[PDB]
Design an enzyme around this catalytic site. Structure first.
Site: not given
Lengths: 353, 359
Positions: A200, A234, A239, A290
């Protein structure tokens, strides 16, 4: 479970997260989620003064943070802080729920940096600053000097992009805890623990360990093509819900670039862009939020192990707002298990085992 | 929402089983350590295994200096469940779970140390004393009573504490066990899963029912007064805590066990009000509403007869249910499947940003 908070590019109560990050400070977005609307100049001015007054830590909490080891997982520091603050300034009733959410948003920056600077630099720091925004206040406490206007802007952009994201493991943990009518500090403590798990949390930390291996964009592309053929995961790409892009990538990419320019970086942003281009050419995979967050935090001098703690400073706004919804409309699945164990058997005394 | 081999509740035959053994046989014939071993390690231990487990748990009862100094700074009037939550959070920074290979060692440490985390805080804040966190009692059940009262407990008191910790050890899926498994599904550490579980158990729709039963039975100086007042509470549609169940049809197997032990304690301490008041409320609830008492009801009187403050009741449940919580986390780690249903959007349609000036 119902929610009016967000939906999937990404909206917060109907407003595009891209518009919010461009034109708003984080406090305007925390107000939207916790209170229900964007705040007019009077409300925003009152809100800002309320939070500026909730930044210092009680003496007892300072003395607790001093006993957490230097080599502790920073997420256990954030967990322990929230847990102790609950015993010092308790939520006696749900009437105080918005006041407590505000207190967590204002204090979390000091819980992280008081611990960090005590254990790593042997300083006991002042938990107040002159920065009027949380984003500026954080950088002022971490480096003990006034931040540049660019770095205050990028900190405000990041807190807005990560503030809320529908349902996921940490938001679900906050709602399950909320559904028993537990206190706000319990729901946040549990959400932090779930975010600690590597399936998470830790994504921008893992993106940073990937980009920091490569001394040039040539070397990066050459090594990525080898990883892609080897079918390696990677970090920072793909998503579960979006298919063309993650709206938040758009925004952070451009700020990471301005920071690279500012600090005269020659390697880190070029390496990031080479990986981004290669993933699209070879896999038609867009990067998520991210990926460019890692270079940007690094350019502002943030230790990698504080990345996920900064996400806690941001996502506390979404988590608390979700708890308020669960309390007002207490609907959630009640789970049952499939039994796969042994049939009923006679008790066996110690002598026959 | 997941799969488990640990327990079945409400099925034919024994109403409650732990890996196939009737909870009523375990509570009669076993110490808690035998049941913790069954849940965490997979079988009832043999004599050599039990001897070594008791010696291991006996050496894991003391608290680090740094943890003691933290508990000294939690206020006297704090919720005792926030004390258990804080203690587990701090212990995870001091004795970290570096590998899932340590997972049964960390579960054991929590079972052995929880009694000292509760009593060191309670007696520091309530008496101004720093207590020894070691005792001469061989079992957790006895050790808890030695730390709380600072003297040797009676055999009868040690047996009832052992019965209570077995009865409350495991209960399949519920809010706190589900919280621990959701946290376990992200591959978080074991201290995170327990801290999360304690938070959910703090909520009054899950925790606290045997504290509510104590606050009902302590109001009455005669059983005849309890009966007359209960008839009025039923007229007001008040909810009577400790009665009925969402899963059990006809009885809660844990009730018949703790009721017998509460009666023996009443006789030992010379009680003539609190057990009689409890039985009157039981008999009235049956006659008026055919609701049976659940595990919570006779637990209130049993704990009170052993001199336990009401606000330490849910923390005693934490000492017991940590066995079930941790065994559930190990299952989640070995077989990581769970459902976390998405929410439905009921909010406003997409709208343009309104700059500050026009708000």
């Amino acid at each position: 479970g119902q929610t009016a908070l967000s939906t999937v590019g990404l909206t917060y109560r109907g407003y595009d997260v891209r518009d919010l990050a461009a034109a708003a400070i984080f406090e305007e977005v925390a107000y939207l989620l916790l209170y229900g609307e964007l705040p007019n100049k009077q409300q925003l001015d009152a809100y800002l003064k309320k939070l500026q007054g909730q930044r210092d830590l009680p003496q007892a909490l300072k003395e607790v943070l001093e006993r957490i080891p230097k080599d502790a997982h920073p997420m256990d520091v954030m967990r322990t802080g929230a847990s102790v603050l609950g015993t010092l300034e308790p939520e006696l009733s749900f009437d105080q729920q918005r006041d407590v959410a505000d207190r967590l948003l204002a204090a979390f920056p000091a819980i992280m940096t008081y611990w960090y600077r005590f254990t790593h630099e042997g300083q006991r720091i002042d938990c107040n600053s002159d920065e009027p925004t949380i984003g500026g206040h954080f950088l002022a406490l971490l480096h003990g000097k006034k931040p540049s206007e660019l770095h205050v802007k990028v900190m405000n952009v990041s807190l807005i992009l990560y503030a809320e994201h529908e349902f996921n493991a940490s938001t679900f943990t906050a709602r399950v805890c909320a559904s028993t009518l537990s206190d706000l500090y319990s729901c946040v403590t549990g959400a932090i623990g779930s975010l600690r798990g590597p399936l998470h949390g830790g994504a921008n930390e893992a993106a940073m360990e990937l980009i920091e291996r490569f001394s040039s964009p040539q070397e990066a592309t050459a090594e990525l093509l080898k990883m892609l053929e080897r079918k390696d995961k990677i970090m920072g790409f793909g998503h579960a819900i979006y298919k063309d892009s993650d709206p938040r990538n758009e925004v952070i990419k451009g700020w990471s670039k301005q920071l690279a320019d500012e600090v005269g970086d020659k390697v880190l942003f070029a390496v990031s862009e080479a990986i981004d281009k290669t993933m699209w050419e070879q896999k038609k995979l867009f990067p998520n939020a991210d990926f460019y967050h890692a270079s940007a935090y690094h350019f502002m001098g943030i230790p990698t192990k504080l990345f996920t703690p900064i996400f806690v400073c941001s996502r506390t706004s979404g988590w608390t707002a979700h708890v308020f919804e669960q309390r007002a409309n207490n609907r959630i699945i009640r789970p049952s298990a499939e039994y796969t164990g042994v049939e009923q058997r006679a008790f066996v005394p110690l002598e026959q085992r």
